[PDB]
């Protein structure tokens, strides 16, 4: 299937493409031709990947100099595996068409914990542990000692990789993570480091955001080599939250105590090092005078001089002083306090800690800790986190804020206070990506309206188009139910949350919808506490028992183990004729991680508009700062955060292969024009005024009729 696109001719593996695919390809080609960053939305969970990859490959063939390589990022490794599968299929199709191999390379990066071949680190699954063990095995000290070949466990894979892969790079091919593990085992090399080197000469590289956003690890692999590369973020509508998380650092009392203990161990190790080997490790002082990774981005990062901290004892005392200041500032009991610049000024005044020497604290920590030949960085990780916070605060506070919480939420009195350093704008941390890369395409599904995104992230978009899925059959028939059998408002307001009548309306709607809907249904609440209250009310009444009789019921919990077990049983229930009703939370990690396909989550129920609690002070900074700068109304941003989350958690049923399914929102709030307008275009256009505010019974009847229509073949 060769498509004569306006720009050029583009190959395509599958037989047919919908008109929305034509629109997507033409808009994407327009953006690439303009060579300017832009944002676009496409409904389908699958199909967008293949269309995007095919268009990018064809554009690379036409203008190889224009685009050096493609950097395609996905939320999670299980998801990016499907992307690499799609890319492998596309490459096989193109190779068959051409009749011969071409110099094209495509690979996926992942954590050493996810992929590795060392038996010692295999049993351990905790990421910091894998990082520390690998650092110990690959340490420059361990490398030098391996040169001596003394009796000590040395990781042969990295040494063999240094010997061979340095000389010879991999010719070409596509390697999934699992297949790359096998390749590393066969060749006695690192599946991780081999891909890391291939990044220098790779046409396509795929990895999650935290490999491309956080300055600590993103920069090293996203160096200026890709000066003009097509960087693409997929389903990255929750990009602001992750970009903020890449900067926010949380300091707790337990973490601070662990830091103090680690610092004591550091002092003891320094004394032992002084008595054992002093001159050779003191040479570090000379190289320092000449002049865990830094959290400072490219331009913000500075390397002039370490500062007044030039020796191990001096640096240790500096950390002692700063840790004492943080300890006392956290121990203070008072209302939540915000102080972005005042915190730095007060630190400098109270404990005599100048911001310039504080700036290089984390970098000097890395160097000095390397000198100590520690067993691993896992033990001292809390100290490195505190150092990253210490350097960040001295680095900048213009678009940041230090929040102190002596008392935690959900606890009238708790002896574990927490100090947050949550950011307020993601533009600060995502600026390097936009500036360095010629164009970035934020391709997303279920995207809340694009107009806000340029305001939140400071960039000038080239194209702003919303693509609506078009099929010969109406795959999706969304509806909103606001009126119950009692013709009573069913809004899940904070003041209306306690309403037993509203809870009863929700329970009856779920009962009837489970009675009619086929096997497999997922209901998303607004919070764990609200879900528990509704479940308890239904349990006190007889509605819950009737729901249990009609279909099996499963519930989500904060604990990941129970969540995984419940979802595993839910899948089997969906396969069998019992069916299942999975209650979950919109913010729950399960909602974002899981993907619902044919005969999975057939009818997506949304109980109440997803709104975060109006007491969490972090969102207060994040929101009022957005009001002050970029001029976004607080209500506007709050409703945007609700609609984007709802679209994220309701857009799964249309994953791909044209699998029918209905999305019912049991809240009259969605019927409001603002919510409908902010809803994604593809869902909204299907939505109509006739079914906008159906009663519970009317919604059930129309759902039954729509399921009848979708049951029959094409």
């Amino acid at each position: 299937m060769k498509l004569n696109v306006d720009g050029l001719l583009v190959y395509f593996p599958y037989d047919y493409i919908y008109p929305e695919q034509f629109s997507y390809m033409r808009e994407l080609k327009r953006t690439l031709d303009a060579k300017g960053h832009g944002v676009l939305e496409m409904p389908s969970g699958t199909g967008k990947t293949v269309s995007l990859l095919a268009l990018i490959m064809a554009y690379q063939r036409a203008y190889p100099l224009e685009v050096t390589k493609l950097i395609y990022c996905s939320r999670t490794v299980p998801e990016i595996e499907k992307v690499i599968e799609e890319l492998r299929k596309l490459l096989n199709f193109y190779e068959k068409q051409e009749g011969e191999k071409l110099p094209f390379l495509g690979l996926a990066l992942s954590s050493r914990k996810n992929l590795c071949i060392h038996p010692e680190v295999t049993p351990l699954r905790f990421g910091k542990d894998v990082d520390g063990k690998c650092h110990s095995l690959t340490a420059s000290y361990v490398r030098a000692q391996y040169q001596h070949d003394t009796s000590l466990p040395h990781c042969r894979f990295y040494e063999e990789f240094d010997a061979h892969g340095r000389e010879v790079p991999l010719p070409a091919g596509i390697y999934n993570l699992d297949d790359l593990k096998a390749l590393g085992r066969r060749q006695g090399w690192c599946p991780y480091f081999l891909a890391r080197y291939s990044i220098l000469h790779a046409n396509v590289v795929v990895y999650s955001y935290h490999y491309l956003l956080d300055p600590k690890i993103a920069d090293l692999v996203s160096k200026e080599l890709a000066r003009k590369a097509v960087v693409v973020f997929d389903e990255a509508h929750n990009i602001d939250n992750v970009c903020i998380d890449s900067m926010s650092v949380n300091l707790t009392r337990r973490t601070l105590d662990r830091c103090q203990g680690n610092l004591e161990t550091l002092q003891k190790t320094v004394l032992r090092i002084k008595e054992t080997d002093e001159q050779r490790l003191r040479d570090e002082y000379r190289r320092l005078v000449e002049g865990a990774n830094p959290v400072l981005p490219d331009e913000v990062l500075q390397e002039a001089v370490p500062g007044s901290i030039r020796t191990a004892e001096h640096f240790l005392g500096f950390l002692r002083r700063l840790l004492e200041y943080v300890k006392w500032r956290l121990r203070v009991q008072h209302v939540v306090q915000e102080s972005p610049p005042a915190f730095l000024s007060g630190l400098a005044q109270r404990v005599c800690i100048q911001r310039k020497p504080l700036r290089f604290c984390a970098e000097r920590l890395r160097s000095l800790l390397h000198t100590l030949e520690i067993t691993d960085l896992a033990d001292f990780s809390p100290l490195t986190l505190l150092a990253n916070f210490a350097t960040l605060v001295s680095t900048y506070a213009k678009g940041f804020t230090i929040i102190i919480e002596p008392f935690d939420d959900r606890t009238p009195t708790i002896a574990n206070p927490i100090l947050h350093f949550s950011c307020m704008d993601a533009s600060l941390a995502i600026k390097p990506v936009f500036e360095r890369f010629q164009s970035v395409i934020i391709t997303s599904g279920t995207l809340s309206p694009l107009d806000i995104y340029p305001k939140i992230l400071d960039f000038h978009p080239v194209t702003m188009a919303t693509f609506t899925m078009t099929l010969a059959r109406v795959c999706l028939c969304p509806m909103i139910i606001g009126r119950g059998n009692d013709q009573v408002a069913i809004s899940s307001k904070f003041e209306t949350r306690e309403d037993i009548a509203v809870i009863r309306n929700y329970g009856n709607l779920l009962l009837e919808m489970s009675a009619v809907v086929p096997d497999g249904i997922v209901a998303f609440f607004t919070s764990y506490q609200y879900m528990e209250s509704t479940v308890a009310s239904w349990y006190e009444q007889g509605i819950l028992e009737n729901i249990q009789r009609n279909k099996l019921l499963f519930i989500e919990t904060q604990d990941g183990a129970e969540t995984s077990v419940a979802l595993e049983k839910y899948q089997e229930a969906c396969e069998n004729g019992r069916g299942a009703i999975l209650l979950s939370v919109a913010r729950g990690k399960v909602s974002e991680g899981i993907d619902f396909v044919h005969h999975y989550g057939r009818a997506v129920i949304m109980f109440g508009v997803p709104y975060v609690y109006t007491q969490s002070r972090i969102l207060k900074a994040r929101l009022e700062y957005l009001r002050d700068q970029f001029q976004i109304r607080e209500n506007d941003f709050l409703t945007f955060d609700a609609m984007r989350h709802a679209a994220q958690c309701v857009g799964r049923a249309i994953r791909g292969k044209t699998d029918y399914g209905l999305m019912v929102f049991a809240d009259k709030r969605f019927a409001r024009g603002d919510k409908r307008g902010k809803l994604p275009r593809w869902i909204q256009e299907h939505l109509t005024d006739a079914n906008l505010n159906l009663t519970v019974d009317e919604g059930v009847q129309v759902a039954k009729y729509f399921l009848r229509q979708m049951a029959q073949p094409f």
Binding site: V516, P518, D519, G520, N550, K551, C574, E575, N576, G577, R578, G579, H599, Y660, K704, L707, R708, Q709, M710, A711, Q712
Partner: protein, 98 residues
């Protein structure tokens, strides 16, 4: 299982067929039905479900794997058509023997 018990001793030449008029989408069974699907395929018993007001996934896989056809009632008139169509003998496939 009852149908299989009765049809197991039936002659090989005759075509053993089952038409499940499914009404309630739920299926509470003592044992997993996917295992029974294997025995049904081994015994070459055609099973063609006719669902009512539901596109049941387990019955969809049952029908397509066992060789039967799956349908859902659009209305009473279409129900008449479905059953009248099922009246006629089904074509013999490769697994079928005479």
């Amino acid at each position: 299982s009852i149908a299989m018990q009765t049809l197991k001793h039936m002659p090989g030449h005759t075509s053993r067929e089952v038409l499940i008029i499914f009404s309630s989408l739920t299926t509470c069974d003592p044992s997993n039905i996917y295992d029974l699907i294997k025995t049904l395929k081994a015994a070459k018993i055609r099973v063609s479900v006719i669902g009512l007001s539901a596109e049941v996934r387990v019955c969809t896989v049952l029908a397509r794997e066992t060789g039967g056809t799956y349908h859902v009632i659009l209305d009473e008139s279409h129900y008449k058509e479905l059953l009248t169509h099922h009246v006629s003998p089904p074509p013999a496939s490769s697994s079928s023997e005479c």
